[PDB]
Symmetry: D2
Subunit: 363 residues, 4 copies
């Protein structure tokens, strides 16, 4: 075919650098970008009103935890609201995030919508006037974005059209971000729901990731400037077989070795239902797996870096410090886990081994 | 593959019926849906302010022309504004349109955006929350929608990604309309600009239409419930060869016979630069062409049903009647032309043989 | 894209003409091209040795039946052996076929082979040095060829790769024939085996035919120079619902209207298990169906034009005349059926209403 | 989608092991598989008759060179004839190859054929009854096969259909080999001919390799059991810019990092016109390039391991030893080069810096 280049050398360069910092050795991403209606479902759990101050406070208590979290967090995905919010020192949260060394993201996707002619499969919207929105968030201090897609394992799903749609709207989104100087995180999530086993999950991650990378290459996207955010390959939540963690690690790194090119900068994992310990152990075997892992293999965790601190805050302002202890413990844990240097053996659960799995309903 | 049906029998039925009425024998569509910034460029031509009343008036003078236009117009594409406007009798324009027998459309597309990594190729946006908008327009009296896509003939274009993107966003749009009870008009426009000849245009319409129909079939869309709106195959505006009208007709019906299935209800042509007579002669040879034409072969004309009436109004309210004479002459002409019963030979030009070709710039 | 034309005007012209004669009003194709191992299975039925003379004789008795079959048969698909055989008048069988007005085909496919990684799905081979073989058969008097492909309806089949492979090897084959002056018959057969209903069959014919036509268009193939040979849409042989013949006709012409372009010259049906009457009634409702059928809708029958004559010959040379009566009755019947002018009502079965359905095993 | 596994654990295992031995640290492949008509063109060069003994002898002198070549050659691609030939010790050449430690391949492709509707683009044949042939060669001691495909850089080529065809017939071939216990070498060769620069070549390797890997994944092929054999990215032979070797190395490893998954065992390079030194220097910078190279990066050289020994033999039996010195020097050189430990600086050319570039004509 023929080349009317997408990007300049200068732009290829900004892109790989923001990509490299995010997933530098030991770092991961905090996924703090629940919409208002998901954060609300979470605040109920500790019977607290879902209002703007509480949401500001809550975020304030995750971003301003002490400097032991600095070498641990390469970036934080924000929701559009929190992007324009201030800590009580009156400095806005993109300046708090930068100052403890991390890179500020924003989520730019507007949800999933049903694909007609499907057993429940969705695609996801957000492109209309995306570009405009990439240009403003970059002005405001966001350097990376995140778009989510959902696939499902069922008797007749993910359908071919489902794979193909979801792949192509990742790539559209990818391109429009790259043109605004923003690294797109790509999230093709295969849901955990169902009673599939470890091997079906593996099969499906493989056909999905394959579809994404071709799409990306069709769409011209500059892969060093991107990150993958995929499911780890696990049985399904209803599965009657039990599987070890080295198995899940194997399942996972093999599917990723069969599909993801060595130019991608790093793959940041989603928690997807695992609990705080279950995630961290899983992340850690992944980096202990003997196979050649040509990309960073790190965390991009939302519920998993938050359960415990949420149970511990309980909405009472007087518990700030106990909640940050909480989050910190988990950002310590994962920094260790992303390096294969995590050792639980001892080292305390509670709310950390409670399962954080919800209805994957739809919208 | 496997069937989780998109549509019910009841819904297949409403869809084919709105589709059949639009392009009933003798009828065509008036394309009155210029956005505000395109109508504005048009009102300048007759030095009149581009304001809301003038735009209301102007539309009022096309929709309320006499009943000699009734058997001629199966439907009218409106712009979102004119949908909520009233004639001076205080009845809104969807009720004026219905009452002279025609079916009300709306345009639902939000423009074209550049595809990066391309020699100028665009895709087009509008999906975000499309569905919501199909559901409201159907409530307000729209039964068909229109989405435009643009391809370009150049040395290295239409690129493969261009074909593939444009095809797939037609089909996404198609599906979401069908689910709200609305017939999607599909407009894959190959631009006329350039110096290609008649045969390149033909080649390109053929690879494009092929891509659209596969896409449609991937996306499950119920084809009897749709209409095509394509370019006729013509040389390029800069072309040094001259070509006859029977040639253009041949070029055109052959490409359409090689690609469009006999389940599509009818293809409504775009003017795309031809002048009022040039369009009508062209439409008319198309229906005189000896080849088996298994679908209605009619007009969906905007500038072509409007030049003359625009020159004639000149924004002076005192010329109402002369402008409607004007539009009427052209809706007569085309009703004849869509049936192959059009005879110019005599029968007066002016502004009718002036070329209505603009920069296809981009946005 | 860009045009380095496949074919010249001269070659487009020979191609559409051989295509037109085959399926001229009232005509159909006799499919006499069983390989040696399938004809052998047939000769067992009447306990006769499967040798070269018997096979010559047998073919001799189908091609030299009286002139009441002339206006009925536009062409005859031969097997490579029978191509070089002589009637006992010492004129070879391509000259016998021509002289009663029909066009001589050959089968050029070499069977199906398993696709690995499939629940039993095959593709089909024959391309190696195909061209060489098209060039010699055209020299010997073949003007059309036939290639068969097999899809299967099962819980997880036809798989996507199955559709895609089978489509693309039809198109490869198509192109190589067109370049030797030979019309390719295209046979994407969906098998009848299973317990699917009428609607699954319809769904599957539709996704399959869609895939074939895109493939054809990718491969540049000149569609007027081709013929389709597809399954009619029927429930599956194990199906517990009973369906009428007008239903099967509807199912069938709708799927064909949704997918096959009006440039294809004519679709010649396969019998696929139906019995002599069942085929003919089915063909005849197809041409009685009210829907607009923009292509000839005729027969390409092997077992269905042969059961009765096979039972009647019984390998005894003394029954020649009774067998030709037999075949003749069925070529009469179908000529009527392809025109919707067939009336059984009375008019004698026997072996004509016996089912001619076999294991669709594989090879 | 859904899994009816292609291969068993036992079969995955034989496949990765033959794949690993081929491209073990320091080893490469000798490509000794010229057909009779290409070897003949080569023997002319030294005015010797192209007969069966000479061809046996010639091959005898490459396979029985001393043990300094053992740690250097992981495998040797033979032509079908040489597979059944004996050294003068009366042991056949698969036993000579095994005994000096290497793995025996065979070429199974039958040439390229023109794709109609193309500016000269070909696909390649060989599938008919491939399987049968994989099964016999494995019985005779072949454990890997090789299939070649050709793409071309021109104004309008490689066309999309060209990419797509060539990709899919690699994958068909791939699958059929894996099912017979044979590792397929995959050769998507982009030709060097033309006046493209280094960057077009890179663009094209990237769109091509992308297409191959999707195809492979569609076709289910088990990637650890395969090897890539691609062009290095170089300007075109008519190119007026000069480019360094670190540039060519960069161009090359970046394209391979953007497309080839880390599960492929190793990529064996083709010489494609470079001369003995030019190849070896090029191979060696490739392994000196700082980028993370997650797969072996070695040689699969035919003319490049043979020029000098061919000039030196001159068909006189009395020069055996000088020719093997010759080949040996080059198998030393490359073993060094594949490890980035090659140092020319000094170390003698002649015929080693003569260019081995031919017309890429077609067949
Ligand atoms: O970044 C995430 C990670 O979660 P984990 O599975 O790693 O804990 C998610 O993938 C996002 O789904 C998101 O919070 C859901 O949409 P939202 O709730 O705002 O409307
Ligand atoms: O329905 C149409 C027909 O025009 P003709 O080529 O048949 O005269 C067009 O295809 C639309 O492009 C439209 O008026 C352009 O976008 P808008 O100007 O509102 O922002
Ligand atoms: O032209 C045909 C029609 O049969 P009907 O279903 O219309 O009776 C077939 O589709 C061919 O399968 C063929 O005789 C089978 O391969 P063969 O047996 O020689 O090795
Ligand atoms: O394995 C090869 C390597 O050559 P180099 O470019 O690495 O020297 C080739 O890619 C093959 O083309 C082959 O010898 C050509 O077909 P053949 O001549 O037998 O009919």
């Amino acid at each position: 075919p023929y080349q009317y280049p997408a990007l300049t050398p200068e732009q290829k360069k900004e892109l790989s650098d923001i990509a490299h910092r995010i997933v530098a050795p030991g770092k991961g991403i905090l996924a703090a970008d629940e919409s208002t209606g998901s954060i609300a479902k979470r605040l109920q759990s500790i019977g607290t009103e879902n209002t703007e101050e509480n949401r500001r406070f809550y975020r304030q208590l995750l971003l301003t935890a002490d400097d032991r979290v600095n070498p641990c967090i390469g970036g934080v995905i924000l929701f559009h609201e929190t992007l324009y919010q201030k800590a009580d020192d009156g400095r806005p949260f993109p300046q708090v995030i930068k100052s403890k060394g991390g890179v500020v993201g924003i989520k730019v996707d507007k949800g999933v919508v049903p694909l007609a002619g499907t057993n429940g499969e969705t695609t996801t919207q957000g492109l209309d006037g995306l570009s405009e929105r990439c240009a403003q968030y970059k002005k405001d201090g966001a350097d990376f974005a995140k778009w989510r897609c959902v696939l499902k394992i069922g008797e007749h799903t993910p359908s071919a059209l489902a794979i193909m749609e979801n792949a192509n709207v990742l790539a559209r989104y990818a391109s429009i971000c790259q043109q605004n100087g923003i690294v797109p995180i790509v999230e093709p999530e295969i849901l955990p729901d169902g009673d599939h086993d470890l091997k079906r999950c593996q099969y499906v991650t493989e056909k999905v990731l394959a579809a994404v990378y071709k799409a990306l290459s069709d769409h011209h996207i500059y892969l060093e400037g991107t990150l993958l955010k995929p499911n780890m390959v696990t049985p399904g939540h209803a599965c009657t077989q039990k599987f070890s963690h080295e198995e899940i690690a194997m399942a996972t790194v093999t599917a990723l070795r069969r599909t993801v090119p060595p130019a991608v900068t790093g793959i940041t994992f989603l928690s997807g239902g695992q609990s705080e310990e279950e995630a961290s152990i899983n992340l850690n075997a992944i980096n202990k797996c003997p196979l050649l892992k040509p990309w960073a293999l790190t965390f991009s965790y939302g519920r998993a870096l938050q359960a415990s601190a949420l149970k511990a805050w309980g909405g009472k302002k007087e518990n700030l410090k106990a909640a940050q202890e909480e989050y910190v413990k988990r950002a310590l844990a994962n920094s260790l886990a992303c390096q294969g240097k995590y050792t639980p053996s001892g080292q305390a659960g509670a709310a950390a081994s409670e399962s954080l799995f919800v209805s994957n309903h739809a919208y």
